[PDB]
């Protein structure tokens, strides 16, 4: 019998909401900051309850699906990560009614997967198609969501910078989802938010040039993945040294083989060299690097291992491990490589363009100090994601909790007109839909029960003539005062919870 | 030591094996339920499975009746392929039926002797459901696409199943009378999507060699070898290792350049255009290979080289024990085709028409490993289908059939033994209750509806579980393999009686 | 004296930040800002106990 | 516990050859004071074992300049060797002491 896994399910259904019920307060731009008590004990004022899930959580398998639920919303959208929490606990309320009714969870699973496919179809008709190749249409569509979000204090000047950034990788009108795996975020320690801009190719950190060039035209991007030293067990220079001759005879011979490997670099043609950390190897010999930099090659050193793997795929500098991999395809081809030392504190190397597949786009984040720099980082990336979610889903939907009240109004109607032993499941699926804007219409104030029934007063007759407007703090049409969102941040918040729900229904 | 008495052992066998049968009946069926994986040790990591074999691997089994089931779960896993979760619930369905007999008074040797005769009688009823499909090329083509949807959906792959469904049934079709797993080369590779997956007619190596070596070889002569260049193998040509001298290094430094020169002369005197080497090929013999037209492969697969000599008719060189007497392989076309993000070697037109290479293309490691394990479980059953091109009508339709035949024999025999045959025919009907619960329906309705079918003999139609409604058989998608159930009926009736044999359990740990 | 004392609650912790925020800027009204906010806490709580959104009172 | 002294002996053995370099380091700076005064007034040889081989002054300046650089290369690895062996053994002084107790 499934009676012992029956009790496991209701415990899992109850426990998944109980962590998610704190996010009901944290829902929306008028949502609540949630002060976190740490496992060692400390206060942490926190909003954006996906980050709360990453920070403080309990060890429960229904709760461990919740941190996975928001993480998928983080990587696919990055937005709607608070709303993706509230939809899943809303669906679990629908699950409790039907399991008490005596409906198999296999039935409740497949009914939700049908209604998910069915709801986004009707939601798409609610959406309006916007351009993805018109740069100006993308500008108006993005910043209205950016003014709809919390941070717009720096998103004003940083919206069109992101618009010009994505427009380079918008080659078709289809305009695929977006790789952020060519988008590099680069901090500059000084400078200004006004001086933040988009530098093509990739932007490097501190160079280490012994006698090397500063500005090389038509550079050759090289990679080094080999050591320049002796084996190490206790000492880098394994001598039992007490003598001047034994330290002279063996260490001049260490200079000998690194003479010949350095000459093979410049003869094959190299101007920019990618060197990882000397803890990612055993040692890197700077005297050979001095002789290398005396052969007029600009060199950076001490970069991360996986960060090179970002660089190799972005600018086409395919991995060079030895002398034999000195070729024309393993080496990238920059048009101009130089370092900018001025316009702000610090100094950052500029690979201004490279022979790159697609378009390698890099932003330089500036600011007074690190906290001011970190303000723009959320400001750019949220601006990057709202463009990213609109090029994934062509049409645009006005945001503000109203299309859920729209869609639940149709899905109750269609589930009656369709048929079903599972018709209750879809009609309970639609009853879960208006929970989330109701919990949003608590954070706006202005009683949500009185609120939510008067939006589908307008969604039934005029199909929308009033909305929930956090600008007004309540009843105002999201088409009257424009509150919009991409289509993806609503759909991706919707579909991941449905896939999560059908799993835990089938989970014993 | 703890000597478990029989009154205690029956309680332990009932809590031991049935709870395991509770888990595998959840993860049966594509519509069926799942199971959260809770690691028995510290830091329990969670996965969600539709496979009962992984549950036994994660969650440790130390129930002595259920530890017998782990051995039975392994046999249908490896030798049979599909049928792992099905054999383990079915023995539990037997043991539930034995409970009321044990509750009455009844000896288990009554219960064993009844189920032995009932198994062989239903086995002939299982042979009554044997229907050929190799009588037509088209019906055997229709036979392969039937079972390919069955095994893959049973072992957690249903989203991109149909792209693998078209490719796998083609390579099994070239086997033609002989079931082969050493002719079907199985290659997983990251890159592309699951619609980018590929079927090569012949053999494949994942070698990026470019234009330094010949990649276009027409009318090939294939030397299958393991002869290195710097390893200084058997049949010595110069110096050997020695001590107690300081000036003997000059004979060792010079002898390496002669051996690498001589092995180029050895390889060319075969007459080949392709030297396949398991070991690394040094740069100086490698550049001597591409100019003459000898293909050079370094870092070859340890199992791929041995499968290469079978499909091409060649032979391994046995680590240079055969310098010339090693036979050569021959194929039609050797072509470098970029499949996905990678440059691949396609040995096309090999000497075996049975020989093929499926090329799995997963976008990540999470989808690629789970695809091959389901696909390897499919091709083992499909190779058994090459020997016997037969089906039995799935969806519990054959389960309803054989339980009637036992019931007829239980209503002709019934001395002492066929009290168990009455409990036997219920446990066969207990399996379609699971699938109706996997589909999530009235199992008591659908069985008694299906019991009414095979009572007069409506055998050509059983329950299509996607709606749970009765539907067509003899190919539907749900009409299952003959080779699977004859193994599942064999093992489940076997070990459940063995559990009835062990009443004298003694725990000394 | 709050700088002399040590905090006990995070509720006690956040207000020691607030009076010091007043005290760094000016020396007047520094002990007064503590008393005003605590009066707000009892006033809004009864309304939240009554029927009122916490969002609505702080507006 | 043998693991306590073993990380110390591997550290202290490297220090003894490193302290050898520092007196050589000072005298490598002494000879550069003396090579700067020579411009052709006195030529230099090289004392290498049982053979005393002729040098030049520019040949001498590079010679002691290299040996100055090889000392500094062995200084920096010991700073890695110092912090690693003192931190690994510090973790070992807590865990391996509990092994002998129970």
Swiss-Prot record, chain A:
Modified sites of kind N6-acetyllysine: 263, 277, 294, 301
Gene Ontology, cellular component aspect: cell body; cell projection; centrosome; chaperonin-containing T-complex; cytosol; extracellular exosome; melanosome; microtubule
Phosphoserine carried by residues: 11, 159, 177, 419
Main EC class the enzyme belongs to: hydrolase
Molecular functions per Gene Ontology: ATP binding; ATP hydrolysis activity; ATP-dependent protein folding chaperone; protein folding chaperone; RNA binding; unfolded protein binding
GO BP terms: binding of sperm to zona pellucida; chaperone mediated protein folding independent of cofactor; chaperone-mediated protein folding; positive regulation of protein localization to Cajal body; positive regulation of telomerase RNA localization to Cajal body; positive regulation of telomere maintenance via telomerase; protein folding; protein stabilization
Residues engaged in binding ADP: 28, 80-83, 147-149, 400, 485
A Pfam entry, by short name: Cpn60_TCP1
Keywords: Acetylation, ATP-binding, Cell projection, Chaperone, Cytoplasm, Cytoskeleton, Hydrolase, Methylation, Nucleotide-binding, Phosphoprotein
Residues annotated as binding Mg(2+): 79
EC number: 3.6.1.-
Cellular localisation: Cytoplasm; Melanosome; Cytoplasm, Cytoskeleton, Microtubule organizing center, Centrosome; Cytoplasm, Cytoskeleton, Cilium basal body
Keyword Transmembrane: no
Catalysed reaction, written as an equation: ATP + H2O = ADP + phosphate + H(+)
Residues reported to bind ATP: 28, 80-81, 149
Domain of life assignment: Eukaryota
Matching NCBIfam families: chap_CCT_delta, thermosome_alpha, thermosome_beta
Xref: PANTHER family: CHAPERONIN
Family indicated by similarity: Belongs to the TCP-1 chaperonin family.
Protein name per its UniProtKB record: T-complex protein 1 subunit delta
From Swiss-Prot, chain B:
PROSITE patterns (UniProt xref): TCP1_1, TCP1_2, TCP1_3
Annotated ATP binding sites: 29, 83-85, 480, 485
Binding site for ADP: 29, 83-86, 153-154, 395, 480, 485
This enzyme's EC code(s): 3.6.1.-
Modified residues (Phosphothreonine): 246
UniProt: Mg(2+) binding residues: 82
Residues the record lists as N6-acetyllysine modifications: 139, 166
Keyword rRNA processing: no
An annotated GO cellular component: extracellular exosome
UniProt modified residues of type Phosphoserine: 45, 245
Cross-link Glycyl lysine isopeptide (Lys-Gly) (interchain with G-Cter in SUMO2) per UniProt, renumbered positions: 233
Subcellular location as annotated: Cytoplasm
Functional summary from the UniProt entry: Component of the chaperonin-containing T-complex (TRiC), a molecular chaperone complex that assists the folding of actin, tubulin and other proteins upon ATP hydrolysis. The TRiC complex mediates the folding of WRAP53/TCAB1, thereby regulating telomere maintenance. As part of the TRiC complex may play a role in the assembly of BBSome, a complex involved in ciliogenesis regulating transports vesicles to the cilia.
Stated family: Belongs to the TCP-1 chaperonin family.
Complexes and interactors: Component of the chaperonin-containing T-complex (TRiC), a hexadecamer composed of two identical back-to-back stacked rings enclosing a protein folding chamber. Each ring is made up of eight different subunits: TCP1/CCT1, CCT2, CCT3, CCT4, CCT5, CCT6A/CCT6, CCT7, CCT8. Interacts with PACRG. Interacts with FLCN. Interacts with DLEC1. Interacts with SVEP1.
Protein name in the entry: T-complex protein 1 subunit beta
Lineage, top ranks: Eukaryota, Metazoa, Chordata, Craniata, Vertebrata
From Swiss-Prot, chain C:
Positions annotated to bind Mg(2+): 28
Lineage of producing organism: Eukaryota, Metazoa, Chordata, Craniata, Vertebrata
Task performed by this protein: Component of the chaperonin-containing T-complex (TRiC), a molecular chaperone complex that assists the folding of actin, tubulin and other proteins upon ATP hydrolysis. The TRiC complex mediates the folding of WRAP53/TCAB1, thereby regulating telomere maintenance. As part of the TRiC complex may play a role in the assembly of BBSome, a complex involved in ciliogenesis regulating transports vesicles to the cilia.
Domain of life: Eukaryota
Clinical condition linked: Intellectual developmental disorder with polymicrogyria and seizures: An autosomal dominant neurologic disorder characterized by a broad phenotypic spectrum. Main clinical features are developmental delay of varying severity, intellectual disability, seizures, and polymicrogyria. Additional variable features are non-specific pyramidal or cerebellar signs, and visual impairment.
Subunit structure: Component of the chaperonin-containing T-complex (TRiC), a hexadecamer composed of two identical back-to-back stacked rings enclosing a protein folding chamber. Each ring is made up of eight different subunits: TCP1/CCT1, CCT2, CCT3, CCT4, CCT5, CCT6A/CCT6, CCT7, CCT8. Interacts with PACRG. Interacts with GBA1. Interacts with DLEC1.
Record's protein name: T-complex protein 1 subunit alpha
Signal peptide positions (record): none
Positions spanned in the full protein: 61 to 119 of 556
Residues that, per the record, bind ATP: 29-31
From Swiss-Prot, chain D:
GO molecular function: amyloid-beta binding; protein-folding chaperone binding; unfolded protein binding
GO biological process assignments: chaperone-mediated protein complex assembly; chaperone-mediated protein folding; negative regulation of amyloid fibril formation; protein folding; protein stabilization
Residue positions, PTM N6-acetyllysine: 9, 54
Keyword Ubl conjugation found: yes
Keywords: Acetylation, Chaperone, Isopeptide bond, Ubl conjugation
Cross-link (Glycyl lysine isopeptide (Lys-Gly) (interchain with G-Cter in SUMO2)): 54
Primary role: Binds specifically to cytosolic chaperonin (c-CPN) and transfers target proteins to it. Binds to nascent polypeptide chain and promotes folding in an environment in which there are many competing pathways for nonnative proteins.
Protein name, per record: Prefoldin subunit 6
């Amino acid at each position: 019998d499934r009676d012992k896994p029956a009790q496991i399910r209701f415990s899992n259904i109850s426990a998944a909401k109980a962590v998610a019920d704190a996010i009901r307060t944290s829902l929306g731009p008028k949502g609540m900051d949630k002060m976190i008590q740490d496992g060692k004990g400390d206060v942490t004022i926190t909003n954006d309850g996906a980050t709360i899930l990453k920070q403080m959580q309990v060890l429960h398998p229904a709760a461990r699906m919740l941190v996975e639920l928001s993480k998928a919303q983080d990587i696919e959208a990055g937005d709607g990560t608070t709303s993706v929490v509230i939809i899943a606990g809303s669906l679990l309320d629908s699950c409790t009614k039907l399991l008490q009714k005596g409906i198999h969870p296999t039935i409740i699973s497949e009914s939700f997967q049908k209604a998910l496919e069915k709801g986004i179809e009707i939601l798409t008709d609610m959406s309006r198609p916007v351009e993805l190749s018109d740069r100006e249409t993308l500008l108006n569509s993005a910043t209205t969501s950016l003014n709809s979000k919390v941070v717009s204090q720096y998103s004003s000047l940083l919206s069109p910078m992101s618009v010009n950034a994505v427009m380079k990788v918008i080659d078709p009108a289809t305009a695929t989802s977006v790789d952020l795996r060519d988008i590099k975020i680069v901090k500059k320690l000084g400078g200004t938010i006004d001086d933040c801009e988009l530098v093509e190719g990739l932007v490097l950190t501190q160079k280490v040039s012994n006698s090397g060039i500063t500005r090389v035209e038509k550079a050759k991007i090289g990679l080094i993945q080999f050591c320049l030293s002796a084996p190490k067990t206790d000492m880098d220079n394994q001598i039992v040294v007490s003598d001047y001759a034994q330290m002279d005879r063996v260490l001049r011979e260490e200079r000998a083989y690194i003479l010949n490997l350095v000459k093979q670099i410049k003869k094959t043609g190299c101007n920019v060299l990618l060197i990882q950390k000397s803890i990612l190897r055993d040692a890197l010999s700077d005297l050979a690097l001095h002789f290398l930099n005396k052969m007029k090659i600009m060199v950076i050193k001490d970069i991360e291992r996986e960060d090179i793997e970002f660089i190799c795929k972005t600018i086409g500098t395919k991995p060079v491990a030895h002398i034999d991999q000195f070729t024309a395809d393993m080496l990238g081809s920059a048009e101009l490589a130089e370092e900018v030392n001025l316009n702000g504190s610090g100094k950052l190397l500029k690979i201004t363009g490279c022979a790159s597949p697609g378009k390698t786009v890099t932003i330089v984040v500036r600011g007074s100090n690190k906290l001011v720099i970190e303000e723009a980082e959320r400001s750019i990336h949220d601006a990057l994601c709202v463009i990213r979610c609109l090029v994934k889903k062509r049409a645009l939907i006005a945001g503000g909790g109203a299309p859920e009240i729209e869609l639940a109004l149709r899905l109750t109607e269609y589930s009656r007109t369709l048929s079903g032993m599972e018709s209750y499941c879809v009609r309970a699926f639609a009853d879960a839909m208006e929970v989330i804007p109701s919990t949003l219409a608590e954070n706006a104030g202005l009683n949500p029960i009185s609120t939510v029934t008067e939006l589908r007063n307008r969604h039934a007759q005029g199909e929308k003539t009033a909305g929930i407007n956090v600008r007004k703090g309540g009843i105002s049409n999201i088409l009257e005062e424009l509150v919009v969102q991409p289509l993806l941040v609503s759909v991706s918040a919707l579909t991941l919870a449905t896939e999560t729900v059908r799993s835990i229904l089938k989970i014993d | 030591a703890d000597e478990e008495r029989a009154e205690t052992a029956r309680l332990t066998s009932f809590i031991g094996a049935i709870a395991i049968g509770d888990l595998v009946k959840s993860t049966l069926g594509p519509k069926g339920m799942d199971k959260i994986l809770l690691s028995s040790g510290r830091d329990a990591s969670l996965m969600v499975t539709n496979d009962g074999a992984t549950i036994l691997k994660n969650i440790g089994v130390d129930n002595p009746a259920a530890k017998v089931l782990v051995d039975m779960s392994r046999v249908q896993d490896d030798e049979v392929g599909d049928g792992t979760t099905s054999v383990t619930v079915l023995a539990a369905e037997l043991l539930r039926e034995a409970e009321s007999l044990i509750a009455k008074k009844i000896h288990p040797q009554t219960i064993i002797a009844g189920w032995r005769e009932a198994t062989k009688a239903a086995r002939e009823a299982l042979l009554s459901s044997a229907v050929d499909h190799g009588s037509d090329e088209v019906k055997f083509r229709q036979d392969l696409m039937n079972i390919a949807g069955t095994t893959l959906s049973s072992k957690l792959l249903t989203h991109h199943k149909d792209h693998f469904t078209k490719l796998a049934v083609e390579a099994v079709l070239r086997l033609k009378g002989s079931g082969n797993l050493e002719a079907i080369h199985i290659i997983k590779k990251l890159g592309g999507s699951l619609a980018d997956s590929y079927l090569d007619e012949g053999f494949l190596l994942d070698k990026k060699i470019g234009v330094n070596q010949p990649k276009r070889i027409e009318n090939a002569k294939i030397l299958i070898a393991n002869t290195g260049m710097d390893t200084d193998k058997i049949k010595i040509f110069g110096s050997r290792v020695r001590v107690d001298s300081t000036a003997k290094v000059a004979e060792i430094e010079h002898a390496e350049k002669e051996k690498m020169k001589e092995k180029v002369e050895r390889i060319l005197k075969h007459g080949i255009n392709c030297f396949i080497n398991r070991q690394l090929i040094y740069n100086y013999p490698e550049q001597l290979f591409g100019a003459a037209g000898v293909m050079a492969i370094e870092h070859a697969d340890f199992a791929g080289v041995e499968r290469l000599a079978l499909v091409t008719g060649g032979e391994i060189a046995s680590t240079f024990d055969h310098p010339e007497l090693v036979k050569l392989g021959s194929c039609k076309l050797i072509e470098e085709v970029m499949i996905g993000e990678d440059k691949l070697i396609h040995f096309s037109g090999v000497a075996l028409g049975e020989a093929c290479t499926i090329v799995l293309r997963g976008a990540t490691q999470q989808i690629l490993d789970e695809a091959e394990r389901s696909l390897h479980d499919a091709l083992c059953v499909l190779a058994q289908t090459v020997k016997d091109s037969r089906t039995v009508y799935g969806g519990g339709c054959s389960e309803m059939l054989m339980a009637h035949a036992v019931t007829q024999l239980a209503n002709r025999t019934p001395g002492k033994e066929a009290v168990a045959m009455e409990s036997y025919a219920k446990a066969l009907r207990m399996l379609p209750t699971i699938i109706a619960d996997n589909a999530g329906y009235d199992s008591a309705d659908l069985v008694a509806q299906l019991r009414a079918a095979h009572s007069e003999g409506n055998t050509t139609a059983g329950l299509d579980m996607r709606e749970g409604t009765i539907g067509d058989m003899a190919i539907l998608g749900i009409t299952e393999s003959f080779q699977v159930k004859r193994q599942v009926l064999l093992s489940a009736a076997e070990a459940a009686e063995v559990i009835l044999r062990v009443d004298n359990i003694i725990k000394a740990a | 004296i709050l700088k002399l004392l040590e905090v006990e609650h995070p509720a006690a912790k956040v207000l020691c930040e607030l009076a010091d925020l007043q005290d760094k800027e000016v020396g007047d009204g520094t002990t007064s800002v503590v008393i005003i906010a605590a009066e707000l806490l009892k006033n809004a709580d009864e309304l939240v106990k009554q029927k009122i959104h916490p969002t609505s009172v702080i507006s | 516990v043998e693991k306590y002294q073993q990380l110390q002996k591997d550290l202290s053995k490297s220090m003894s050859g490193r302290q050898k370099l520092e007196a050589q380091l000072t005298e490598n700076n002494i000879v550069k004071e003396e090579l700067a005064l020579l411009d052709g007034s006195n030529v230099v040889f090289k004392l290498l074992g049982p053979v005393l081989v002729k040098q030049e002054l520019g040949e001498a300046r590079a010679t002691v300049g290299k040996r100055l650089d090889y000392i500094t290369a062995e200084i920096k690895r010991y700073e890695s060797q110092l912090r690693d062996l003192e931190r690994q053994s510090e973790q070992q002084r807590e865990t391996l002491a509990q092994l002998q107790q129970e």
